[PDB]
Write an enzyme that holds these catalytic residues in place. Structure first.
Site: not given
Ligand SMILES: [Cl-]
Length: 171
Positions: A93-95
Site C-alpha cells: 500500500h501507499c498513501e
C-alpha cells in the site's frame, strides 16, 4: 476467479475493484480481518508492505507494517531469506490510490519469478490495500501507530520528499 501465482489454490481474501485491473485489491475491513486473526488457521504469516517514504511512515502507519519504499530494500527484506510457512500473503500500500504500491507489487513478482523454476513462487498471493493509509486510518485508528496521518505533500516535509526521491533507482 483465477488461482494464485503458483497455481496451487484460490485467492483466500474477498477482493474489491481498484485502479489496476491486473492486481488484487482488498478493503480496510479485510485488512482488519487479517490483523485480528480471522484467517489464523490458514494464514501462517502476512507482511504489510508500506511503500511510502520514511517520513510518511513515521507519521503514522498500520501496526506491524514494514517500510520498504526502495526496490532494493524490498527485494532484500523479502527475497534474500524468504518468509516461509498454510499460506504466506503480502499486502502492499501507499498513501491512497497512487503508483508506489502497484509498482512494488509488480517488481516483487518479477524478482520472485526470476529466482524460481516456473510456476513456483515464494510469494504467490499478493494484494494492494484499496485507498491505502488515507482510507485505513479514519476507519481503524487503533490499528495504527502512531495515531496520526502525515501526507506525502505535507508542507513541512518538502525537503524530505526531495531527499528521498534522490535515493530511488529511477524517476
Ligand atoms: Cl527504488
Amino acid at each position: 476467479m483465477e488461482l494464485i501465482g503458483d497455481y496451487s489454490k484460490a485467492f483466500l481474501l474477498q477482493t474489491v475493484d481498484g485502479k489496476h485491473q491486473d492486481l488484487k485489491y482488498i478493503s480496510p475491513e479485510t485488512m482488519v480481518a487479517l490483523l485480528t486473526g480471522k484467517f489464523s488457521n490458514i494464514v501462517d504469516k502476512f507482511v504489510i508492505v508500506d511503500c511510502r517514504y520514511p517520513y510518511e511512515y513515521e507519521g503514522g502507519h498500520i501496526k506491524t507494517a514494514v517500510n520498504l519504499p526502495l526496490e532494493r530494500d524490498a527485494e532484500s527484506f523479502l527475497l534474500k531469506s524468504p518468509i516461509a510457512p498454510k499460506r504466506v500473503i503480502l499486502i502492499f500500500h501507499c498513501e491512497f490510490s497512487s503508483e508506489r504500491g502497484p509498482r512494488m507489487c509488480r517488481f516483487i513478482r518479477e524478482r520472485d519469478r526470476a529466482v524460481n523454476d516456473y510456476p513456483s513462487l515464494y510469494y504467490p498471493e499478493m494484494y494492494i490495500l484499496k485507498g491505502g493509509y488515507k482510507e485505513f486510518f479514519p476507519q481503524h485508528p487503533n490499528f495504527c501507530e502512531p495515531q496520526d496521518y502525515r501526507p506525502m505533500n505535507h508542507e513541512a516535509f518538502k525537503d524530505e520528499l526531495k531527499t528521498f526521491r534522490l535515493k530511488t533507482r529511477s524517476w
